[model samples]
Target: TSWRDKSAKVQVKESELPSSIPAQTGLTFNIWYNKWSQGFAGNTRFVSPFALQPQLHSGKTRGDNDGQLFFCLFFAKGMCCLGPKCEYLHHIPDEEDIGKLALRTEVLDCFGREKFADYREDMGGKKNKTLYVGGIDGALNSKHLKPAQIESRIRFVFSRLGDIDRIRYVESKNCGFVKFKYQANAEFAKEAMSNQTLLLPSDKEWDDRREGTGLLVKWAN
Candidate 1:
């Protein structure tokens, strides 16, 4: 064909071109195919890459109708006055939110690094009503202290936190569990007692007795 000719005599095969165009542009199958193919095929005789699509809104994106509500800042501290009338969601802060609200812990691990951890209950702050208190003074188990005396010491230390439903001591493991009638009390006690020393190195009973490592408190889980 001459340069002046409107049409080239040479033919282009379907396989010579690209397999597909970018999906981001949101073009329809028929329009894309016919336009690229020089209108050799009409809309009637068509096969297209877009058949799998919904066949509607081919050139436009589906609408986003997400209706997620924001958390109500005022409702977080135990109560909310707006109730059902509020635009924001009303509920106790989730575990993640509670962690965000909690002050970073100043307690250190046995190795001396500052301890940081999550103490939230499985379902929320009030789900579990038990506390695991470990690192009990081994001195309490020594010959000088009677079983009644040991139990009394533990009771005296933890009872100050709140009304205790039960306290179980594992003398062999130097640990104990304190269960409370209310989860709220257990939660408060855990915050107050972690990394605190329950017994001194030297007490009137004995100067060289085995002493308690500071209390290590955490949720029962």
Candidate 2:
């Protein structure tokens, strides 16, 4: 770890993505250049735009296809304090080594809705329930931010779902997972929010369309 906290920006060739990532990758990265403090439950956390921003980062043009993509990987501003628990990058097997790409539901509504059930069933039961929603950008952590805000946001959102048996933070996870009493209830909540829009910017619309925003789910188990 370095003892520096300064603005650092750089550009690197697409080849920089290490080959050791393996065929099946499990890491996730969010890259954005904006702030989202009051978007969710009156909380002040930065939800990176890279999660929804167009081809700012993708493999299609990583070689030499203009500036079509942006480098991405999971990032957490408050992760450094938790020893091995801070490791956000996870891997299972034979998949691409690169970070998991964030999928936007607005692009395809029915796809997100239809797949929600199957995805929920995959969780099996509550003992292992560990999916995460609403990512917090490390780049935005600052004095003005309070831990309560993050915790409250997690609590508030999870509360919307059914059978929320408990809500707690794990330093290791770097994110909080809401445990529901039953699998069916969790699935209900998942189905309801998957691809659903939760927050939209009010200040101005992009191009002619208004800024559409909401809490998006990203799996981490």
Candidate 3:
């Protein structure tokens, strides 16, 4: 409200004020620089790159450590007691992995396989509803697991991604293509299942060596 005296009274709600007002003291401010020299510059947080890969959660496909998404939590905390028994990839993502995370959001073709296209380049003509899932565990058909059995296992896993329109599995090549009814579904599946490993339902032993390392998933080119 304004008055003729050129004075105005403004009304404000309590919510308009900051919830927690920050206060500083002269001594506290002085101590900041003193502490900074002794505390921060000389100390920087760091960890080994080899200790930052995904860890397996017991015999399950996923891990119990969600804090370090795609990384080993125990390794990050310097308490990884498993040594060789650790189920996670105990290495930081390399150039190939960094490349995949940048350009290829999903796994496909081959493990560490780089996409031919540039990151910023438009995939205008390449966009499709079909996904090309490669680097599948060839052992799915080996060790008494038949082709039909492998296909069934693959379908069971992929079907959860979306309503799969078609599946073409080539046992000889150890790769397959999955076609989803909708592009959105395929995209979701691609991102969700990227860099994932698929194991047989009957396998009681899920170890680092037994686990299929390459379950690359990516959009069909």
Candidate 4:
């Protein structure tokens, strides 16, 4: 199921996760609305074996059907809203620090220096790519994965983990946010994945053949 399945269609295969997410341990799910609009109004706060108080909407209705609502997923970072496409850089502590969640990070490894340099050239703003805050995995293709697909995987991971506040995307680079449910989770995830041997550093600069075999991940909080 899509992490933010307000549509509730449960797009499984597309989600690329096991169908038994409902069976996963330590997982919490909820269906609630944050606003009181006609169709979507309520709040879904979950913990363990979560509790949800469905607040049915009131006031103007059928006429305001245009106000449709969908389920949204969130990851809890340290309340850092870095604008669109992470246009700003905020220093939030990594999980290894005082336990604060993160908002955005660099994607220098997956996309490479060329991709980030391209953003600097086209976007026209101060820029740099760090290990994106909430990344899970990337498409098999190295440089041309669909942006939407990358965004989806990020949302899926957060929803499953359960405590997020907000999130955003960073273009063709296979990196994104993983705002945590609690600041601790955010910090924990970064620490858990840091120095991981999944995607190795590129050796193009060194002419070494086995240099880029594993993934290289780090947290810049």
Instruction: Assess each prediction's global lDDT (C-alpha) against the native.
Output: 0.42, 0.32, 0.44, 0.28
Task: Give me the candidate number with maximum lDDT.
Answer: 3
TM for candidate 2 is 0.32
Per-model TM-score versus the true fold = 0.38, 0.32, 0.42, 0.28
Better of 2 and 3 by TM-score: 3
Residues forming the 10-long window of minimal summed lDDT in candidate 1: 52-61
| Residues 36-138, model 4: lDDT tens digits | 1112211221111111111111112221233211111211112111211121211122233222111222332110111234444353322222235422232
Ranking by TM-score: 3, 1, 2, 4
User: Residues 1-221, candidate 1, lDDT per residue (tens digit)?
Assistant: 22122211112233544456422113454465446545433322221111101111111101111222223322221122333443432332234423433333334221112233434235533245688877565323234555566667667666754568899887777678889765545554564465444443365534433233335678776
**Highest TM-score: which candidate?**
3
lDDT of 2 by residue, 1-221 (tens): 11112111122322433333221122221111121223333233323232221111111222112321112222111111121221222111011211112223222111113234344647542233445654332322321335565566556545644447777655444455667654433433443343332222331332221123334454436
Q: Which ten residues in a row have the lowest lDDT in candidate 4?
A: 46-55
Clashing pairs in 1: 137-212
How well does candidate 3 score on lDDT at residue 164?
Answer: 81
Q: Which model is ahead, 1 or 3, in terms of lDDT? A: 3
